[PDB]
Design goal:
This is Low-density lipoprotein receptor-related protein 6. LDL-receptor class B repeats lie at residues 45-87, 88-130, 131-173, 174-213, 214-256, 348-388, 389-431, 432-476, 477-519, 520-561. The protein is mainly β. Helix content is 1%, strand content 50%. The chain contains 1 helix and 56 strands. The strands form 16 sheets. A 4-stranded antiparallel beta sheet has the order 3-2-1-24, with no helix packed on it. A 4-stranded antiparallel beta sheet has the order 4-5-6-7, with no helix packed on it. A hairpin with a 4-residue loop joins β12 and β13. The longest helix has 6 residues, at 562-567. It starts with a strand and ends with a strand. The chain binds a molecule of 2 linked components (NAG-NAG) (2 copies), 2-acetamido-2-deoxy-beta-D-glucopyranose (2 copies), calcium ion (3 copies) and chloride ion (3 copies). One chloride ion binds at residues 158-160.
Length: 609
């Protein structure tokens, strides 16, 4: 097989033949803005690249076909990237997010492997046959680190270096090569970071490096060239190609650079998701972010409970766990201005309002199955009745509470009055009630009504100025709200009894709130904070996360007890009801209708007028 050298420069990935240096061509890719890190896969001759301007990681065949973005969310500066050709994983280092991550080569099952005490990780190199990965860190005190390829047993391998790049392993000879931008040289060590030897010096900015057979190849920005030298002696130096300024990466493309074996074998180690190499020649089964590995050490389980929080253009998920796993961005396309979110735990689908396009949309957490539920309306807030399978939502333009089935079929309006201004809304189908803020002129109110709009009552009319967020927790039997003018968070029993102020200090702009276990979580848009308060009163107010821009909503997802769920009388085929099914205070469950219809004598069906 003829070996080739690939390199990135500007928006191009170019190929040079190491047998005939004159032959230089561009790989036929479209849509590239800035080609950065490069790699390939020996199995199928796909090329992989990062684009630090577009914030993506992509792949394609060398003929340009099957071009796809395998990572396109939650990146900032993906400067390091490598293919694990044995486990069939993609690894990357993001200098902006300070994370080292992994996924399958097609982008599935993304997981964060390193995220704590990480300062500008840059050049990544993998040794899947041995089960170790290596990377450089710039930032405060530059160093080269090593970890197992599942992220475990992280150590500093080389503590005394300048800003290092082009980290490359000679797998045949068991040596690690890198460039040093500050000491102005290329050097190598053994795999333990010992027996260091300078190969070439007087290189003001050796930015890229690779190795093939007896030669190293590098590019120095001051020389504007790609050069080659003997890897051991540093002699026999020649120019491969000149007049190449600011080359970002170089890669020897040849099958001998992706050899060896490991115990993942041809079966992904029988791991359900990720097969991650660990020393020596072995593996562990890995899981997507927030999943847990089952007792069998092979299969993964999705998180049973988590918190969602939205920004203007992102929906994020976080978990509370012993590892303190990091928050992730959900890969949901076409977000523009997310105003409010909800989640259906039965079908595992995220719902949101987008205020740019005035729509209610849904998708799976992995981004698939995107669908428009409601589309001059102006949705403000939404709340899912997970038993009856419909969404209650407020319209800021017509000032109604409308009800729409999850599949988009309208049920109809349950609240409308000439002076009514329904805004925040939350349903409690366990008891048959909905709760809403009513921002009536000169008299804001918190109200409730049965889920068909009957039995309307004002719970609170005093001590309200701009109640902007509303939440409830059926287990605690409590209602919660936040006022952005009085700058406080309050609570009461769901009946309206026992109103209390939870917090009235250091609140600026409390735009959402949610209950997770015994904690009330809220988001403050101005302070850019998620914070929590302990409802048992034992622990103090605690900061959860800071510096989150454009916060819009927060939503806790409890674990769904499927047996309890199916015991809800509206859970089986909407209790036989054509429109609304609801629990009543007298202990019965009944069918009812939106405002334009009446219940017929069968007590199941609604008819006109
Ligand atoms: C581009 O290159 C790829 C990889 O060499 C080609 O993919 C093959 O396509 C054929 C028929 O379409 C299949 O039988 C093979 O299974 C594919 N191979 C792999 C590794 O995926 C693709 O055909 C090429 N495209 C062009 C236009 O030449
Ligand atoms: C409540 O929302 C539904 C959408 O879920 C609205 O239904 C639309 O009504 C318009 C005319 O008013 C029709 O052109 C559309 O075809 C309807 N869409 C669907 C999916 O049925 C309904 O108008 C809303 N009701 C109120 C009172 O605002
Ligand atoms: C590289 O240098 C080493 C040490 O001097 C020598 O043994 C080897 O033959 C050289 N290889 C090439 C390809 O020049
Ligand atoms: C799973 O691995 C753990 C150690 O991580 C070990 O104690 C246990 O025996 C393993 N269980 C199975 C079923 O392989
Ligand atoms: Ca590289
Ligand atoms: Ca320098
Ligand atoms: Ca809500
Ligand atoms: Cl050292
Ligand atoms: Cl009151
Ligand atoms: Cl809530």
């Amino acid at each position: 097989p003829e070996a080739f050298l690939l390199f990135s420069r500007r928006a191009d990935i170019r190929r040079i033949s190491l047998e005939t240096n004159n032959n230089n061509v561009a790989i036929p890719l479209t849509g590239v803005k800035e080609a950065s890190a490069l790699d390939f896969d020996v199995t199928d001759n796909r090329i992989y690249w990062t684009d630090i301007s577009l914030k993506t990681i992509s792949r394609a065949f060398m003929n340009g076909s099957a071009l796809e973005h395998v990572v396109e969310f939650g990146l900032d500066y993906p400067e390091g990237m490598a293919v694990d050709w044995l486990g069939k994983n993609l690894y990357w280092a993001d200098t902006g997010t300070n994370r080292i991550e992994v996924s399958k080569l097609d982008g599935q099952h993304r997981q964060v492997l390193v995220w704590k005490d990480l300062d500008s990780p840059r050049a990544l190199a993998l040794d899947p046959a041995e089960g170790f990965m290596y990377w450089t860190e710039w930032g405060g005190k530059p160093k080269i680190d090593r970890a197992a390829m599942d992220g475990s047993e992280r150590t500093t391998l080389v503590p005394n270096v300048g800003r290092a790049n082009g980290l490359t392993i000679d797998y045949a000879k068991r040596r690690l090569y890198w460039t040093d931008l500050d000491t102005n040289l290329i050097e190598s060590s053994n795999m333990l970071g010992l027996n260091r030897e300078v190969i070439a010096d007087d290189l003001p900015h050796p930015f890229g490096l690779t190795q093939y057979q007896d030669y190293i190849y590098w590019t120095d920005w001051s020389r504007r060239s790609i050069e080659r030298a003997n890897k051991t002696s540093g002699q026999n130096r020649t120019i491969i190609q000149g007049h190449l300024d600011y080359v970002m990466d170089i890669l020897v493309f040849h099958s001998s650079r992706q050899s060896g074996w490991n115990e993942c074998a041809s079966s992904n180690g029988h791991c359900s998701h990720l097969c991650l190499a660990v020393p020596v020649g072995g593996f562990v089964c890995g899981c997507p972010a927030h999943y847990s590995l089952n007792a069998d050490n092979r299969t993964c389980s999705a998180p049973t409970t988590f918190l969602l929080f939205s920004q203007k253009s992102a929906i994020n998920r976080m978990v509370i766990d012993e590892q303190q796993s990091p928050d992730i961005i959900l890969p949901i396309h076409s977000l523009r201005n997310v105003r409010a979110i909800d989640y259906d735990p039965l079908d595992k689908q995220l719902y949101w309002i987008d205020s740019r396009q005035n729509m209610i949309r849904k998708a799976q957490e992995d981004g698939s199955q995107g669908f428009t539920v409601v589309v001059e309306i102006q949705p403000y807030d939404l709340s899912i009745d997970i038993y009856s399978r419909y969404i209650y939502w407020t319209c800021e333009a017509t000032n109604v509470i409308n009800v729409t089935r999850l599949d988009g079929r309208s049920v109809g309006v349950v609240l409308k009055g000439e002076q009514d201004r329904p805004r925040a809304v939350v349903v409690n189908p366990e008891k048959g009630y909905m709760y809403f803020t009513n921002l009536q002129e000169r008299s804001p109110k918190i109200e409730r009504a049965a889920l068909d709009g009957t039995e309307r009552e004002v719970l609170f009319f005093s001590g309200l100025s701009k109640p902007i967020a509303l939440a409830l927790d059926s287990r605690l039997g409590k209602l919660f709200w936040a006022d952005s003018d009085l700058r406080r968070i309050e609570s009461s029993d769901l009946s309206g009894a026992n109103r209390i102020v939870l917090e009235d200090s250091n609140i600026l702009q409390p735009v959402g709130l949610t209950v997770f276990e015994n904690w009330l979580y809220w988001i403050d848009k101005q302070q850019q904070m998620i914070e929590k308060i302990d409802m048992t009163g034992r622990e103090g107010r605690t900061k959860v996360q800071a510096r989150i821009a454009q916060l819009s909503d927060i939503h806790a997802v409890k674990e769904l007890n499927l047996q309890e769920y199916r015991q809800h009388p509206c859970a089986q085929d909407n209790g036989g009801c054509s429109h609304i099914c609801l629990v009543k205070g007298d202990g019965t469950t009944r069918c009812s209708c939106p405002m334009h219809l009446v219940l017929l004598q069968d007590e199941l069906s609604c008819g006109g007028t």
